[PDB]
Design a protein around this ligand. Structure first.
Ligand code: SF4
Ligand SMILES: [Zn+2]
Length: 305
């Protein structure tokens, strides 16, 4: 890397060791930040890993609902973030008011909230799910009808796999990063006839349908353990390409299209250094939010394994 960035990385690691921080980074952080992190993964993987740590201070590198997820499950640890504006546009479009409107219209349908959702919305969820476990969570629920949000694509995917009725909220709730074009897959089928295409379930239906595999980032990681393909084309955010290439240096990983989450890219070497220097910004939740949000997480845990 550029020599100046090297010096920033060195000072970041000096400060985190000095001040007793563990650094957690999401799969979609820039490579330089994945590289300095102690652990890199999806939101739940990170929140759970943190629960095993003896350190009491976490520098979280991702977006707000994820840092808050870490805080909800590690409420006695100090969690900081470099940029308080780093957020999830898809998650923020669902509001507690919208959930309320739907609970009343469909009083016998459990509210299943994807982990990509604001902490406030989680207080009103019956159960949380991840993109990896959503299908099995919904299958295990006794109701044949669920309210599901905030992603319409994941909801629709769940409906296909479970055969249950899924009422997705809010209307056209989606992730823009995962809105790949189906013709991009057609182009890879011609270019790389032996490559396997793996996409996220937040992708739209004709993208999912043309893929060899549909899975969460955690699932993408595991696929090349068993699949012997030399080339994987990956339908998710570009940060995952770095993660995959590091894990499987013997294969190639091609992004299906260049997809960048602007909010994820808000964290930089500069503001990560500043966060360790100043130990800001702390993630602080009202007690009511930590307790209420935690219940549908715990319920997910109960249903799932
Ligand atoms: S990638 Fe899509 S889902 Fe993940 S944070 Fe960015 S917008 Fe939200
Ligand atoms: Zn260099």
């Amino acid at each position: 890397m550029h020599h100046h960035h090297h010096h920033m990385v060195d000072e970041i690691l000096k400060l985190k060791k000095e001040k007793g921080y563990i650094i957690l980074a999401h799969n979609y952080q820039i490579p330089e930040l994945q590289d300095i992190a102690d652990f890199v993964g999806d939101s739940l993987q990170l929140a759970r890993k943190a629960m095993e740590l003896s350190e009491k201070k976490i520098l979280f590198l991702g977006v707000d609902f994820m840092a808050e997820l870490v805080k909800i499950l590690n409420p006695d640890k100090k969690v900081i973030v470099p940029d308080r504006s780093a957020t999830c546009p898809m998650a923020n479009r669902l509001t507690p008011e919208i959930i309320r409107e739907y609970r009343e219209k469909f009083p016998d349908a459990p509210v299943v909230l994807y982990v990509n959702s604001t902490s406030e919305c989680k207080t009103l969820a019956d159960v949380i799910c991840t993109s990896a476990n959503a299908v099995e969570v919904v299958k295990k629920l006794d109701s044949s009808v669920v309210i599901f949000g905030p992603d319409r694509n994941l909801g629709e995917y769940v409906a296909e796999k479970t055969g249950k009725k899924v009422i997705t909220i809010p209307e056209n709730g989606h992730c823009p990063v995962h809105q790949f074009n189906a013709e991009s897959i057609d182009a890879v089928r011609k270019k790389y006839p032996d490559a396997k295409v793996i996409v996220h379930p937040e992708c739209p239906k004709p993208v999912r349908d043309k893929a060899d595999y549909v899975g969460s980032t955690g699932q993408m990681e595991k696929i090349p353990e068993r699949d012997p393909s030399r080339i994987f084309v990956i339908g998710t955010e570009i940060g995952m390409i770095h993660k995959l290439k590091k894990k499987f240096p013997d294969r190639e990983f091609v992004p299906l299209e260049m997809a960048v989450c602007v909010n994820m890219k808000k964290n930089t070497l500069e503001n990560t250094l500043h966060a360790l220097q100043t130990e800001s910004f702390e993630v602080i939740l009202p007690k009511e939010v930590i307790e209420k949000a935690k219940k549908p997480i715990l319920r997910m845990f109960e249903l799932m394994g």
